[PDB]
Amino acid sequence: METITYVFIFACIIALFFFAIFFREPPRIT
Amino acid sequence: VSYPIFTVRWVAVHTLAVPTIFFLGAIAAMQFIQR
Amino acid sequence: AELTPEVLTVPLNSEGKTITLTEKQYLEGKRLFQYACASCHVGGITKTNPSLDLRTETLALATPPRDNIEGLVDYMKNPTTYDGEQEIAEVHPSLRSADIFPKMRNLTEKDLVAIAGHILVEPKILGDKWGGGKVYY
Amino acid sequence: TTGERPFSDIITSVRYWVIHSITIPALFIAGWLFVSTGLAYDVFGTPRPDSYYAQEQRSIPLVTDRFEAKQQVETFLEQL
Amino acid sequence: ATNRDQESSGFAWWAGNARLINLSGKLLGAHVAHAGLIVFWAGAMTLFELAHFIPEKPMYEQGLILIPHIATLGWGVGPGGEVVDTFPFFVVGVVHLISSAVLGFGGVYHAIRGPETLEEYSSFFGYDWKDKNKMTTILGFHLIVLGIGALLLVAKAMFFGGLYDTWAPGGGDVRVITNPTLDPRVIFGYLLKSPFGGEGWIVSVNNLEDVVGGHIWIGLICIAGGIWHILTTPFGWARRAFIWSGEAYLSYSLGALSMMGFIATCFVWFNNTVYPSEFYGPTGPEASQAQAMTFLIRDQKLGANVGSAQGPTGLGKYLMRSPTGEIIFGGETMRFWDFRGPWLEPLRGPNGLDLNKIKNDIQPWQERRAAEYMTHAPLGSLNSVGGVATEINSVNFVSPRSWLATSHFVLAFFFLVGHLWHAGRARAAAAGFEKGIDRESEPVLSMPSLD
Amino acid sequence: NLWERFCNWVTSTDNRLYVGWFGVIMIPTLLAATICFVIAFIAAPPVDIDGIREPVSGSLLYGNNIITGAVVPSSNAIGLHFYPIWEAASLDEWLYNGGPYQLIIFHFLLGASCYMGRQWELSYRLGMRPWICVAYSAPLASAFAVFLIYPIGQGSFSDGMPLGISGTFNFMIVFQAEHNILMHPFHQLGVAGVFGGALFCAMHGSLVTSSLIRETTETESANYGYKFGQEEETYNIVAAHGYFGRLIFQYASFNNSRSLHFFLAAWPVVGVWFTALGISTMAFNLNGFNFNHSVIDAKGNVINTWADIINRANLGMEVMHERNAHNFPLDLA
Amino acid sequence: RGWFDILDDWLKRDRFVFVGWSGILLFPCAYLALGGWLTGTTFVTSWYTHGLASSYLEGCNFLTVAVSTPANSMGHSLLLLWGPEAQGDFTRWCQLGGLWTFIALHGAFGLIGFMLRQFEIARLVGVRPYNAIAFSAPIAVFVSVFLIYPLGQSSWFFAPSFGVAAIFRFLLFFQGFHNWTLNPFHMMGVAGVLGGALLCAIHGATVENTLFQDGEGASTFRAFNPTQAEETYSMVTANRFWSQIFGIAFSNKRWLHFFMLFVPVTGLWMSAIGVVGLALNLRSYDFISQEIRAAEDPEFETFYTKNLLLNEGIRAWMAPQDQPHENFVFPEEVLPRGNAL
Numbered sequence A: 001m002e003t004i005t006y007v008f009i010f011a012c013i014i015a016l017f018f019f020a021i022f023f024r025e026p027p028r029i030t
Numbered sequence B: 001v002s003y004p005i006f007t008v009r010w011v012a013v014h015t016l017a018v019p020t021i022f023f024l025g026a027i028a029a030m031q032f033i034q035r
Numbered sequence C: 001a002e003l004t005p006e007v008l009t010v011p012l013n014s015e016g017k018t019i020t021l022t023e024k025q026y027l028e029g030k031r032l033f034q035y036a037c038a039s040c041h042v043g044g045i046t047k048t049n050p051s052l053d054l055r056t057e058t059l060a061l062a063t064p065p066r067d068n069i070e071g072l073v074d075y076m077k078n079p080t081t082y083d084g085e086q087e088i089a090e091v092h093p094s095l096r097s098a099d100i101f102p103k104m105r106n107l108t109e110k111d112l113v114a115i116a117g118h119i120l121v122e123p124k125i126l127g128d129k130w131g132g133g134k135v136y137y
Numbered sequence D: 001t002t003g004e005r006p007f008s009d010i011i012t013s014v015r016y017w018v019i020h021s022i023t024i025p026a027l028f029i030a031g032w033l034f035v036s037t038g039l040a041y042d043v044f045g046t047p048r049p050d051s052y053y054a055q056e057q058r059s060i061p062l063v064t065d066r067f068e069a070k071q072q073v074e075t076f077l078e079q080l
Numbered sequence E: 001a002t003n004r005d006q007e008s009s010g011f012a013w014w015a016g017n018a019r020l021i022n023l024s025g026k027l028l029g030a031h032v033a034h035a036g037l038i039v040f041w042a043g044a045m046t047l048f049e050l051a052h053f054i055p056e057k058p059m060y061e062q063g064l065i066l067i068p069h070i071a072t073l074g075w076g077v078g079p080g081g082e083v084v085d086t087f088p089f090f091v092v093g094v095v096h097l098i099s100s101a102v103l104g105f106g107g108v109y110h111a112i113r114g115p116e117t118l119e120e121y122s123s124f125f126g127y128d129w130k131d132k133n134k135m136t137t138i139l140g141f142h143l144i145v146l147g148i149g150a151l152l153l154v155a156k157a158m159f160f161g162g163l164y165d166t167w168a169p170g171g172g173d174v175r176v177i178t179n180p181t182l183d184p185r186v187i188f189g190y191l192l193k194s195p196f197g198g199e200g201w202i203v204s205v206n207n208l209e210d211v212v213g214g215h216i217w218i219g220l221i222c223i224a225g226g227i228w229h230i231l232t233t234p235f236g237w238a239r240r241a242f243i244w245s246g247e248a249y250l251s252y253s254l255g256a257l258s259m260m261g262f263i264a265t266c267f268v269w270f271n272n273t274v275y276p277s278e279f280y281g282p283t284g285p286e287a288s289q290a291q292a293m294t295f296l297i298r299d300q301k302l303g304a305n306v307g308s309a310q311g312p313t314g315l316g317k318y319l320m321r322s323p324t325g326e327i328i329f330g331g332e333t334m335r336f337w338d339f340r341g342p343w344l345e346p347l348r349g350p351n352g353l354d355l356n357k358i359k360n361d362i363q364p365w366q367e368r369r370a371a372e373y374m375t376h377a378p379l380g381s382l383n384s385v386g387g388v389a390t391e392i393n394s395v396n397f398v399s400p401r402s403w404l405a406t407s408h409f410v411l412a413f414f415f416l417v418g419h420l421w422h423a424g425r426a427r428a429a430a431a432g433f434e435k436g437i438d439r440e441s442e443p444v445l446s447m448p449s450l451d
Numbered sequence F: 001n002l003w004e005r006f007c008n009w010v011t012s013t014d015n016r017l018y019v020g021w022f023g024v025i026m027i028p029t030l031l032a033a034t035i036c037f038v039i040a041f042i043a044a045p046p047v048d049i050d051g052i053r054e055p056v057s058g059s060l061l062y063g064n065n066i067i068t069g070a071v072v073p074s075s076n077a078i079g080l081h082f083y084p085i086w087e088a089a090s091l092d093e094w095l096y097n098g099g100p101y102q103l104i105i106f107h108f109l110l111g112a113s114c115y116m117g118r119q120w121e122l123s124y125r126l127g128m129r130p131w132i133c134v135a136y137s138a139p140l141a142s143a144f145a146v147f148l149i150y151p152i153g154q155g156s157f158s159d160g161m162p163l164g165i166s167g168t169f170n171f172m173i174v175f176q177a178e179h180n181i182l183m184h185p186f187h188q189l190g191v192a193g194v195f196g197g198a199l200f201c202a203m204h205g206s207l208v209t210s211s212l213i214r215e216t217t218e219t220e221s222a223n224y225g226y227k228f229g230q231e232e233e234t235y236n237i238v239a240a241h242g243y244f245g246r247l248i249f250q251y252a253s254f255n256n257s258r259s260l261h262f263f264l265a266a267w268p269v270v271g272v273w274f275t276a277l278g279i280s281t282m283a284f285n286l287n288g289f290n291f292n293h294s295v296i297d298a299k300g301n302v303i304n305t306w307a308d309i310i311n312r313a314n315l316g317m318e319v320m321h322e323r324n325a326h327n328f329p330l331d332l333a
Numbered sequence G: 001r002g003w004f005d006i007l008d009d010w011l012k013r014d015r016f017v018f019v020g021w022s023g024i025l026l027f028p029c030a031y032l033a034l035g036g037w038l039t040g041t042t043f044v045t046s047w048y049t050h051g052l053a054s055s056y057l058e059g060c061n062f063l064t065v066a067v068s069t070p071a072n073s074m075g076h077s078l079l080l081l082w083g084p085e086a087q088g089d090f091t092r093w094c095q096l097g098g099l100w101t102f103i104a105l106h107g108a109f110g111l112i113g114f115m116l117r118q119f120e121i122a123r124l125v126g127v128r129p130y131n132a133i134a135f136s137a138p139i140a141v142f143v144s145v146f147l148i149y150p151l152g153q154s155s156w157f158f159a160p161s162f163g164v165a166a167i168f169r170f171l172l173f174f175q176g177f178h179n180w181t182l183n184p185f186h187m188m189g190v191a192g193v194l195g196g197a198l199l200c201a202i203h204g205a206t207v208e209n210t211l212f213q214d215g216e217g218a219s220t221f222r223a224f225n226p227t228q229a230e231e232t233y234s235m236v237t238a239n240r241f242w243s244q245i246f247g248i249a250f251s252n253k254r255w256l257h258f259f260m261l262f263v264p265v266t267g268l269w270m271s272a273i274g275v276v277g278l279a280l281n282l283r284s285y286d287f288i289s290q291e292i293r294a295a296e297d298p299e300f301e302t303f304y305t306k307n308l309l310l311n312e313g314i315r316a317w318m319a320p321q322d323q324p325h326e327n328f329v330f331p332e333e334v335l336p337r338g339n340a341l
């Protein structure tokens, strides 16, 4: 049960890495 | 010209520097102490 | 506490006669011990044979007794095992094996007396630290 | 830029060194004599190398009571 | 003052040596004066070591790093590494000191008195960093000089007295090498060995025949490469692959020197052939193996059966098996079972350590050597207290292997950093943006958005 | 030409993540190290790290949490021997002897070196000055010191730092026991580097935030007062300089932004260089300062200092670490 | 105009050293804390409080000198010079550890004076007071470590002594007795400090390597004038570089510098919270599930259990000399040891 929790939190962090890199707010140069 | 002498800067400098030289003399004397 | 002559008073022979070392003699003995013996006898222990050490009780129970100046000088000239049944000069430094232990070449009789005096005085100064090992560090 | 004379202007002047070639060695010698006359041991209570232990003791003199600590240290010093 | 301020040169005082990049005469002066510094340190340090040298005491107990180098060459030593004459050490020191005076005179002369640029004075000594032919010619001259130096080591080994051989029959002795290994299979198989444990790459060279044959090959290869670069211009692929400027050449040399420093660190830490343990002390592996040997001898003399003795974990207390089956010393020194030393090889059979030769063939000199190497392990403090960090203050010892390995790792790492610095700066200066981004023509402004 | 198109794609600055040739090496090695690390951290069987048939369990499935889990270093019986998968007779043997650790650390060290090279490469492609990779060389040197140089000096990859949190703490404590790193000046310079880096980071951040020019109202965040790509400076450097020069004195304050940012780069990078060199030099057993029994009274009694208390703590760690692995009195490696 | 206003004008005068109203608190207290430390490490022993030599006069070097904490029998006594322990005697006051409480209290009030100085100078200059807010984290560290931790413990004795090797002893004590590395609040503190050092290095290197060419000098430091309006480096180029190297990048300079404020300050505050917990011995010493498993299963070993054995060694071998008031006599046979060594 605790192993599933750790792996779930780690996988959520990796998914967040993916979205923060490839679906970021584009830096629009003004 | 016409700079003063005894300012706040003078007091700060000497309150740090006078005991520093005194302590350095003390520790230099400590280097020559045997058991 | 000071290095009084009572501290520097050690047995000379097994009969009971004593000698009193000078502070220069004791310091030269410490220097020569660090020069020639401390690499294996630091702190009064033996690195290459920890079951024997340089404690005064251990030297007293040696055969012949090594808890006096003359016994220690004789050991430095002709080392044996603990029961005195075999000579170990080929693996222990000595005057008779100074050719295979070069640090013993220039050791005079006064140097041997000073080293022996350092060995006998160090437990009287350090207590259980001498020969105690890392427990008493 | 604050109304004081620059440090480089001060320490390169001869009057500064006329004063300080007297004062700096005087303070250095004062500290040297503060240690070498043994006064620092008296002032701060620091043991001399022959004053840590008595001649045949190995027990460290440790303060064990709060409101009699001054007397305990005095008793330690009376035992040399 | 020519190019001696920031306004004319563009470099501040803390980068003031960068003012010398296009001043060939003053740059030559800086190099010759620095070479004088190196030779001065060699001579003065040798005389300092000799002045405090006690010849009966081992060299590694006296903080010596230069006398062991002279002693390894066979100068001043006899059987077993015993010093028989200190005069060659004195000669090496004083000749380096006097030669450093000469080199310092030349460096000072070219730095402050000689012509600032050598191009007007001589087409031969003048150079431009962009002229690739001249750069390869100077490189060829220096390659020939280095090849001659390697052949000088060969000449010392083969004709002028020989080298100290720690593997010589009957203890280490000065031996003349009469059959150097000229087989390219052995030499370049050393070059192609793995750097990992049990293989050790070129650090694992364990006989002087291979050392001398490798230096014969190195001298011939360096002389041939020197002639090649004197007679030939760089090819098209080389011309397109490199930056051709003084800082670029400096960065290439910095990377090479960083790698050589790392290799020298590993050489002095592991190799006991070109760094004999008589002079440099035992290696770390050597000292761990020596401790295991010492207590095997002591307990066997007490009547123990060292082959069947079982440690706390069930492994053999004194003898166990390596992962490939060899009989090795037990305990933590199982990590050091690839160690080879002349005091240990008489006890080794085809299957590793042999029980019968352990029981019957351990000589008193081997027991002495094991005890001495166990109690002079390369472990000590920065203030030179011998032993582990928990040891008390009585033994004044740090092994010269420790000093050499640590100092040259520090130097090799900082030279890798310098290589990165100068390689990046040479690339940026060749492309023209080492002073910063042009505001009007910023490249990223002409690039499409990432998203 | 296919090769010309491939070279154009590899060096293209239009890719979302730059590849480059250093990235051509970096991506497979770091992918291999990452995948093997995740798999080993979750599901590796216990590893006999000390070579004494005493396996240490470091994966989550064998009874660990995030804090106690680790990829255990390879066996002491292996030492510095190269131990790839094909050197083992089976995967069970490779897992028992800590092969995943060697795979991960070798791929990681190669990939991180190529990460440094890739930082140079992208700075070159963008027309930048090239020395960000020099700053990155300090943590990279630290990683090399704890994963490669210390095993080389000590003679076994078992003495490398474990890939875990509690394994890291074990590495630190045993290192202090054996080398007295706290008393080593290079580690003290490293502590000065990281403490000063945190101090100067907080200092620079607070001084810039303190001198932000009013561009927004009280309701909105002040960060909207800066627009990405704007030409004007978003804060008053002179006001921050006036504040910090009155806080200490005028000549302890940077009025030059370039000198200040060079100092911000230089202080922690040089400090971390020195602490990585400290780990490497202690890998060749040049330990920290030994002041045990340094202070001696007139008779000869040992007067203890704080160094003797540190020595007592080090002795406790020394006699308890790897409690079954030592057969002989001296821990020579 | 009133004596208060004239004194205010004098205190806030432009000088080499700013004084201010906060200077009245700061300069005496900071000067006395520094002078007490230098005086104690130069001349004052710890022989009666710890059984240690801790001054240059006794032969200690810079690493081993300290102003040691008072004896454990003092409790949490303020140990005033005129107080009931020293009774006005300066020599006995030094011998009883009064310099430690002198330095600690004057240092606390000097830290208060320095943060008040930050507030006062920020108010006079006309800037926001974020430097004082950032300095709240060293104040939290000092208050939690030097004041709250010994107050939760039995006496001032277990506070850190003001010295290098004494602080190293404090570190090893927290490892051996508290398992402070396992504490998540210390982990957050480590993350904050190392992240602050990383941010410092990376921001400095990024600025220095994205500079605009604003001069012809090959040394670029002269290409900045403090009164200039334009940015000295390219934020767009830096953003693209870190977006392609690392995946993410700052695009807001104000957010970047606030983040540089935020990371080490938050780390230090988290570590201070953990130190409060350790003041009450509320440790993150052990994981109960791992210990139940290890108690019932003699084959289960982790790095955490090895660390617990190391902690047992630290406690047993350190306690007789580190805590001499307890009069611990541990015989050689009760000391936990591994095989050999």
Ligand code: CLA
Residues within 6 Å of the ligand: E002, E003, E004, E005, E012, E013, E014, E015, E016, E017, E018, E019, E020, E023, E026, E027, E029, E030, E031, E033, E034, E037, E101, E104, E105, E108, E111, E112
């Ligand atoms: C190995 C070290 C080394 C060497 C060989 C040099 C060499 C040189 N530097 Mg240099 N430099 C160094 C370290 C070194 N530097 C360091 C560490 C710094 C940082 C502080 C600098 C900063 C620096 C700057 C800022 C500049 C140089 C310049 C120069 C060149 C001309 C110097 C000059 O005009 O002299 C003038 C100095 C003197 C006349 C004083 C006397 C110097 C002599 C040589 C002393 C010799 C002492 C010795 C005991 C004599 C032995 C003689 C005996 C053998 C007979 C010269 C080639 C200059 C340059 O590039 O010129 C274009 C320049 O502008 N350097």
Ligand code: CLA
Residues within 6 Å of the ligand: E013, E014, E015, E016, E017, E018, E250, E254, E414, E415, E416, E417, E418, E419, E421, E425
């Ligand atoms: C053969 C080696 C070599 C050579 C020829 C050069 C040559 C040069 N370097 Mg370089 N460098 C090297 C190695 C080398 N470097 C290494 C190993 C590193 C890594 C640390 C660097 C890092 C480096 C930087 C960061 C920079 C240069 C620069 C330069 C140029 C000007 C240097 C100058 O005036 O220094 C003047 C000398 C000093 C200011 C003295 C420095 C003092 C050192 C750092 C401390 C030494 C401590 C000592 C060893 C131990 C303590 C001694 C005790 C008395 C206290 C010049 C072309 C500059 C450049 O790019 O110009 C174009 C520049 O900014 N170098």
Ligand code: CLA
Residues within 6 Å of the ligand: E028, E032, E102, E103, E105, E106, E107, E109, E114, E115, E118, E121, E122, E125
């Ligand atoms: C790297 C070394 C080096 C280099 C490249 C130069 C180059 C130069 N020097 Mg110079 N010099 C050097 C070292 C060096 N020097 C040293 C060490 C000294 C001190 C003795 C001098 C003293 C010196 C003076 C006083 C003068 C020069 C001059 C010159 C220029 C013309 C020399 C000529 O025509 O050839 C002449 C060639 C020879 C005389 C042949 C010499 C062959 C030698 C003796 C063989 C040595 C063996 C081996 C190669 C070296 C062994 C030592 C090694 C282990 C380090 C030229 C630019 C002149 C100049 O600039 O005029 C304007 C000038 O007046 N030099």
Ligand code: CLA
Residues within 6 Å of the ligand: E136, E139, E143, E191, E192, E221, E222, E223, E224, E225, E226, E228, E232, E233, E234, E235, E238, E241
């Ligand atoms: C100080 C030594 C030195 C230096 C700086 C140079 C410099 C140069 N040589 Mg050269 N050379 C030398 C010695 C040296 N030579 C010697 C002694 C010989 C005789 C064997 C030669 C023979 C030689 C030839 C025949 C040629 C050069 C060429 C060149 C030029 C291009 C170099 C290049 O791209 O190679 C860089 C290296 C490579 C491209 C090889 C690929 C990289 C591999 C993968 C590295 C693997 C090694 C790795 C680090 C592991 C190390 C251990 C390994 C041995 C297992 C350059 C000017 C070329 C040229 O233009 O000449 C006109 C050329 O064709 N050299």
Ligand code: CLA
Residues within 6 Å of the ligand: G024, G025, G028, G029, G032, G078, G079, G080, G081, G082, G098, G101, G102, G103, G105, G106, G109
């Ligand atoms: C403004 C700066 C400042 C501050 C905040 C402090 C603060 C402190 N000092 Mg300190 N000190 C200072 C400057 C300062 N000092 C200077 C300049 C010196 C050198 C002379 C010293 C020398 C010194 C020593 C030698 C000692 C201290 C100590 C102390 C601590 C306890 C003081 C105490 O209990 O009395 C608190 C007293 C007051 C708050 C005064 C109250 C005054 C108000 C206005 C009430 C009015 C009283 C009324 C008019 C008189 C009543 C008469 C009658 C009824 C009694 C405290 C933290 C002690 C210490 O650190 O213990 C470990 C200690 O032993 N100080």
Ligand SMILES: CCCCCCCCCCCCCCCC(=O)OC[C@H](COP(=O)(O)OC[C@@H](O)CO)OC(=O)CCCCCCCCCCCCCCC
Residues within 6 Å of the ligand: B012, B013, B016, D001, D002, D004, D005, D006, D007, D008, D009, F247, F248, F249, F250, F251, F252, F253, F254, F255, G017
């Ligand atoms: C200057 C631009 C570069 C930034 C440098 C960053 C590193 C500086 C590190 C700081 C230490 C060294 C200073 C540089 C020094 C430096 O670069 O020297 C140059 C600087 C200015 O000297 P000048 O003679 O040119 O200027 C004197 C002025 O009066 C001219 O009007 O000299 C000093 O200030 C020396 C320090 C003595 C004064 C110390 C006073 C101590 C009394 C107590 C003060 C307490 C303050 C805190 C209160 C809470």
Ligand SMILES: CC1=C(/C=C/C(C)=C/C=C/C(C)=C/C=C/C=C(C)/C=C/C=C(C)/C=C/C2=C(C)CCCC2(C)C)C(C)(C)CCC1
Residues within 6 Å of the ligand: E029, E030, E033, E034, E036, E037, E040, E047, E094, E097, E098, E100, E101, E103, E104, E105, E107, E108, E111
């Ligand atoms: C350019 C320059 C520089 C540099 C310089 C240099 C680096 C130089 C070098 C120099 C040198 C490098 C020198 C050398 C010298 C030497 C000498 C002069 C020697 C002599 C010798 C002798 C006299 C001997 C003696 C003896 C003997 C015979 C034996 C016994 C012992 C004795 C010792 C007694 C600098 C940095 C400053 C900067 C500026 C400029």
Ligand SMILES: CC1=C(/C=C/C(C)=C/C=C/C(C)=C/C=C/C=C(C)/C=C/C=C(C)/C=C/C2=C(C)CCCC2(C)C)C(C)(C)CCC1
Residues within 6 Å of the ligand: E186, E187, E188, E190, E191, E202, E205, E210, E211, E212, E214, E215, E217, E218, E241
């Ligand atoms: C003496 C001796 C010996 C021998 C040795 C030898 C014979 C050696 C050789 C060696 C060699 C023969 C080496 C080589 C090396 C090489 C290298 C080190 C390379 C480098 C390279 C580079 C650096 C490259 C780069 C590049 C790339 C990456 C790509 C493109 C661009 C460029 C071009 C930049 C022996 C051991 C037997 C024994 C002992 C003694």
Ligand SMILES: CC1=C(/C=C/C(C)=C/C=C/C(C)=C/C=C/C=C(C)/C=C/C=C(C)/C=C/C2=C(C)CCCC2(C)C)C(C)(C)CCC1
Residues within 6 Å of the ligand: B015, B016, B019, B020, B023, B024, G031, G032, G034, G035, G036, G038, G039
């Ligand atoms: C406690 C007390 C007090 C006070 C006192 C004071 C406030 C004092 C001061 C003192 C002082 C104020 C002292 C000073 C000292 C100083 C010193 C002792 C210094 C040293 C230094 C050095 C040794 C240097 C070093 C260095 C560095 C850091 C780095 C670079 C290099 C060099 C080397 C430059 C009173 C009576 C009020 C009240 C009662 C109690």
Ligand code: OEX
Residues within 6 Å of the ligand: E332, F050, F076, F154, F158, F159, F174, F178, F321, F322, F325, F331, F332, F333
């Ligand atoms: O494996 Mn990881 O730690 Ca380097 O020391 Mn010897 O080995 Mn073991 O004991 Mn202590």
Ligand SMILES: [Cl-]
Residues within 6 Å of the ligand: F170, F174, F320, F321, F322, F323, G306
């Ligand atoms: Cl452990």
Ligand SMILES: [Cl-]
Residues within 6 Å of the ligand: E330, E331, E332, E333, F325, F326, F327, F328
């Ligand atoms: Cl062992």
Ligand SMILES: [Fe+2]
Residues within 6 Å of the ligand: F204, F208, F261, G203, G207, G257
């Ligand atoms: Fe900034």
